[PDB]
C-alpha cells in the first residue's frame, strides 16, 4: 500500500536558524486578532542560532519594513511588530554579541542558547477597530556575522 | 542571510473565534479513518469566543450541510459530523446563552470560557467499509449574536 | 458570521497508518539542517498500524529510493534516510511479524503498538558542507500484508 | 549487577462518577499557582475535563466541601480566597446544577462520557487595591459531586 | 529583602543500562491511573522510552521483580492486578528477551541508544464482569533488566 | 454515596520579583535528571522563564546561595557538581548582572514582564574521563536574586 509524503528542506551551511527543539521554523504563520481585547495574539517560538563560527557578533534587521496588507485592497496595511531575543526588530539593525548569546552554555559545539521570537501586529490607529477581511505580508529575515 | 516567512491573519472586529491558547484556528484539517475500528478519529480543539458585547446570545449553524466528497467521484459522499461545546451542529440552528457560556469566568473582558470543537465523519451505511481514495469538503461556520 | 475550514481525509479500509495519538500523519514534512553540527535534525513520530486482520505479517519498502533534490538543479541530490520501528527502510523490503508488533498489547481490536518513524538525510560526502538552496523529494511508502 | 527502576502506581477508583482530564489522564492531586508581582495577580490553573458516569441520563450537582483559601503556612491568620470554576459555572459551597443535556454526552466519545469542560482554579488578594504578604501558602480544593436519581 | 527559589535536584545514575524517555527526560517515580465508571476500565499510562546502554551488542532481558497489584489502601485484601508492557512484549516475573537487533540501535541517535519503544502500565478489575470497590489503591511496578555477556 | 476529589493548592508569593515559566505556570519545586550510560552524560533540564517584577527599570542580580552538588544519598562523600544557567549566563555563588534593557521588557506582554530566557540545570561527573558510581543522588538549586535601587 502507498502513502505519500513530501520531504523538503532548506540548506545553508555558514549560518542558519532553527527552533530550540531542532525542527525547522515554519515557512508561514497565521496571527490571530481579538475583537474583545482589540489586539493580536503574538507568535512566540524558541530558536537556536547555528553557525560554523561562534566568535562572530550577529546583526539583525528585516529586509524591509513588515506589514499585513489587505488582500483585496493594498491601501489597507496594519503594521507588523517583530521581536527577537528581547530586542525589537526593524530595518534599523540590531547587533547581538556572541558572549551575550551564551554559546558554550548550550548544545553541541556552535549552537546558541534559545532566543525568543515574537511576531505580531497592531492597528495603526491602535484602539479603533480594524476593517474586516484577510491580510497578508512577508516578514523577511536578515542576519549576518561580522560588523 | 535571508529566511522568508509568510504572515497572514484574518480580522473581524464584532466577533471572532480563536483557540483557547490564543492562536488562530487552522484553515484546514485532515481527519483520519481507521481500518481496524472502521471509524474516523475526530478532531478536538478548544476555543474561546471573542466579542465586543458579551450580553448577546449566540446562534450557530453550518452555512450548509457538511460532507467529504471523493475527489475523483462526486457521487461518493461520507457525511461530516460537527459538534461544538457539547451541542451537535447542523443547518438546524443552535442557540448559546451568554450566561451559559461563562464570560466573567474567563479571560480579559469579553472572552468566553473554552468550548470544545469536534469534527468527524462516518460512513453513510455505517459499519460497511468505505471505498478507498481521497475525499474533501468545507465545514463552514455561521454564528451571529441576537435572536 | 462565516469562518471557513477545509476538511480532507484519506480512506483505505484494508490497512492504513496513523499517528499514535489517532490523528493522521501529515502529507508533507520540513527537515532541518545544522551548520554547527553539519547534519540534519531527523523527524520522529509515533504510529499505530491499523488493519482488518492482525494475523498477517507486514513487509515494508520505499516505492523508490528517497532523495532531496535541489529545486533549481537536479544534479544535486542529498540522500534521504528512512527508519521505521527500529528497522532501516529502503527498497530492500523489511518484514514485520504480527507477534513482534504487539497487537493485543494495545488499543481496540486490530491496532498495533506504537512504532517509531524517523526520516532524515545526510550529505553524500558526509562531513563536507552541502551547497545552499532548497531541496525536495517524496518519501513514498509501500507496505503489504502476506509474504 | 542489579539494575531496577521502581514506579509507584496509584488510583482513585469511583464506580458511579468521576472527573478525569480530556486526554484521559487523571487529575492532579496537587497544583501550584504562580503569582505575578508585575500584574499583581495569580495565574489560574486551567485543564480540560470530562465527567465519566454510569448514568448519562442523570443531572450533575457539583459543589465545594468548604470555602477554599490560600493560607500562610507560617501564619494561619493570613488568607487569600481561592476561586474555582467548572464548565463555565463558578463553584461554591452553594451547589450548582448541570443538566445531562448541557453536558454534551452525545457529542463525544464513548457512552457515559461528557463533552469537555474547563476547570479553573485561581486565587486573588483580598482587596485588589493591595498586595499579599510574601511567603508560602497552601490550601485545598475539595470537589463534591452527586449525580442523582 | 531576600527572594530565593529552591529546586530539588535528584538523579538515578546507572552506568551500564538505564531506561529513559524518548525526549531524554527521566521516567516518573510515580504514575496515577484514572478509572472510568462509564467504560468500566482504567486508562493506561503510555510513554515512549529508549534503552541507553554501554553495550549495544548485548541482548536485553527485562522482567518484573514481583507481580504488581493495585491494593486497597485501607484494606490489603482488595486487589486489582496491574498489567505492564514494553516494546510490544507483555512483561512479567517470567523474563522476556529483546535482541540487540530488534531494538533498532542503528536507526536512532547516538551510540548505545535504542529506537523508541512503548511502555504501558494499566490495570483492570479481577473479573471484567464486575466493578471494583471505590477507594484509593496503590502498588509498585518494579522493572528489572540485565543486558548480558 | 459521597464522591469527592481533593486537590492541594499551593503558592509562593513574592511581591517584588519572581521567576515564572514562559507559559505562566510556576516553576517546579523539584526536577529529575536522567543520566546516559551510553553517552556518559546527564540530560539537562531546560525551561523557558520570564522574570516578573514590579520595577522594570531596575537591574537584575542573580546568584546561587551555595555551590550545588549531586550527593550520594547513601554516602555523602560522593558528589557530582551541578551546573546551572540562565538567560545564557552561567550562574554561581559569584553574582551575575542582567541589565533591564538586555532582558527585553518592551518586547513582551504586560508591564514588568521580561522576554523569555532559558534556565538550564544539568550535572556532570567530576572527571569526564570516568563514570560516576551507581545509586541515587540529590541536591538543591537555590536561586537568589535582587533587583536593586
Ligand atoms: Mg488537558
Ligand atoms: Mg469559590
Ligand atoms: Mg514521551
Ligand atoms: Mg504483569
Ligand atoms: Mg516552558
Ligand atoms: Mg554552578
mmCIF file with all atom_site columns, C-alpha atoms in Angstrom, chain D residues 19-27, chain E residues 32-34 43-45:
data_model
loop_
_atom_site.group_PDB
_atom_site.id
_atom_site.type_symbol
_atom_site.label_atom_id
_atom_site.label_alt_id
_atom_site.label_comp_id
_atom_site.label_asym_id
_atom_site.label_entity_id
_atom_site.label_seq_id
_atom_site.pdbx_PDB_ins_code
_atom_site.Cartn_x
_atom_site.Cartn_y
_atom_site.Cartn_z
_atom_site.occupancy
_atom_site.B_iso_or_equiv
_atom_site.pdbx_formal_charge
_atom_site.auth_seq_id
_atom_site.auth_comp_id
_atom_site.auth_asym_id
_atom_site.auth_atom_id
_atom_site.pdbx_PDB_model_num
ATOM 1  C CA . UNK D 1 19 ? -13.993 13.694 36.750 1.00 0.00 ? 19 UNK D CA 1
ATOM 2  C CA . UNK D 1 20 ? -10.940 12.946 34.571 1.00 0.00 ? 20 UNK D CA 1
ATOM 3  C CA . UNK D 1 21 ? -8.905  15.091 32.161 1.00 0.00 ? 21 UNK D CA 1
ATOM 4  C CA . UNK D 1 22 ? -9.914  15.399 28.489 1.00 0.00 ? 22 UNK D CA 1
ATOM 5  C CA . UNK D 1 23 ? -6.921  13.268 27.468 1.00 0.00 ? 23 UNK D CA 1
ATOM 6  C CA . UNK D 1 24 ? -7.925  10.556 29.853 1.00 0.00 ? 24 UNK D CA 1
ATOM 7  C CA . UNK D 1 25 ? -5.190  11.219 32.351 1.00 0.00 ? 25 UNK D CA 1
ATOM 8  C CA . UNK D 1 26 ? -6.174  11.556 35.974 1.00 0.00 ? 26 UNK D CA 1
ATOM 9  C CA . UNK D 1 27 ? -6.425  14.972 37.535 1.00 0.00 ? 27 UNK D CA 1
ATOM 10 C CA . UNK E 2 32 ? -1.543  7.982  38.544 1.00 0.00 ? 32 UNK E CA 1
ATOM 11 C CA . UNK E 2 33 ? -4.095  5.892  36.646 1.00 0.00 ? 33 UNK E CA 1
ATOM 12 C CA . UNK E 2 34 ? -7.653  7.231  36.308 1.00 0.00 ? 34 UNK E CA 1
ATOM 13 C CA . UNK E 2 43 ? -6.723  4.487  31.326 1.00 0.00 ? 43 UNK E CA 1
ATOM 14 C CA . UNK E 2 44 ? -3.374  3.023  30.651 1.00 0.00 ? 44 UNK E CA 1
ATOM 15 C CA . UNK E 2 45 ? -0.361  5.123  31.104 1.00 0.00 ? 45 UNK E CA 1
#
